[PDB]
Amino acid sequence: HHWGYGKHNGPEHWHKDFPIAKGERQSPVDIDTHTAKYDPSLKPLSVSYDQATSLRILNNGHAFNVEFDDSQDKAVLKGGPLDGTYRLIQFHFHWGSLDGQGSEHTVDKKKYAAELHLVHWNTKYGDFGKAVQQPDGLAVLGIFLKVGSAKPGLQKVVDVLDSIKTKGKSADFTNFDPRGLLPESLDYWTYPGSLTTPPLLECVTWIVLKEPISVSSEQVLKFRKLNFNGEGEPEELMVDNWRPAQPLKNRQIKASFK
Ligand SMILES: NS(=O)(=O)c1ccc(Cl)s1
Ligand code: NA
Ligand code: NA
Ligand SMILES: [Zn+2]
Known about the structure:
Blueprint lengths: L29 E2 L5 E2 L6 E4 L5 E6 L4 E5 L7 E4 L6 E10 L10 E2 L6 E9 L5 H4 L6 E10 L7 H6 L9 E3 L15 E6 L10 E6 L3 E3 L1 H7 L30 E2 L3
Parallel strand pairs: 1-8, 2-15, 10-13, 10-14
Antiparallel strand pairs: 3-6, 4-5, 4-11, 5-7, 6-7, 7-9, 9-10, 12-13, 12-15
The chain binds 5-chloranylthiophene-2-sulfonamide (8K2), sodium ion (2 copies) and zinc ion.
The site of 5-chloranylthiophene-2-sulfonamide has 6 residues, from β9.
Cofactor: Zn(2+); Co(2+)
Keywords: Acetylation, Cell membrane, Cytoplasm, Disease variant, Lyase, Membrane, Metal-binding, Osteopetrosis, Phosphoprotein, Zinc
Subunit structure: Interacts with SLC4A4. Interaction with SLC4A7 regulates SLC4A7 transporter activity. Interacts with SLC26A6 isoform 4 (via C-terminus cytoplasmic domain).
């Protein structure tokens, strides 16, 4: 037994090994757009990715991670709701078996085909491992994907997936520019939450962009050819690797835009 996204190990089972799954600040949530309040004290988001150094791409049996050098302030997120500098460590996606599902956050109950998470840690805590012991340790930039026209800046990711088909495979992945994954607008919603995979730690300031990016049907079809299993094991397609919306509890979602 190990956690996953199947009938016997999926989100309804996670609380048995990770009791915080039933906690007070779990993610994702539904973003009810009429209940979210504009906050004039929020700042524009500052995304500084010009000096990013990607290193490697890894199939971890749950998703694929594109990893970055986080030993200096090379790719950072400031401003917005944040009171510090947050360094990019990795990005990954969640996606569906069908175009009508796959996102973790929803917007007025609408599901997108996929969701991109750019994961950053607060530099005042020194390393990612210490940051995930803190209530303000992480900031995750979430971006919705809809199916339509292709996203050119995603294609290098699509094309390497053949070399990391199965759990545990990694490949060199240098000189990837994450600026190619952003929409035009940086307008956002924000709320306090958690990692959406075990260990489900309640360390995250979520920043979810209002504008989706559009990717082609062929791009998301290639995500769906990945495998949850290892090489030489029975093939189980890596699809529907999303957690559903969780109770909002005593939280307020704020909007950067009126
Ligand atoms: N899915 S997420 O909350 O971005 C996340 C899961 C594990 C991480 Cl490390 S970051
Ligand atoms: Na509100
Ligand atoms: Na270094
Ligand atoms: Zn995620």
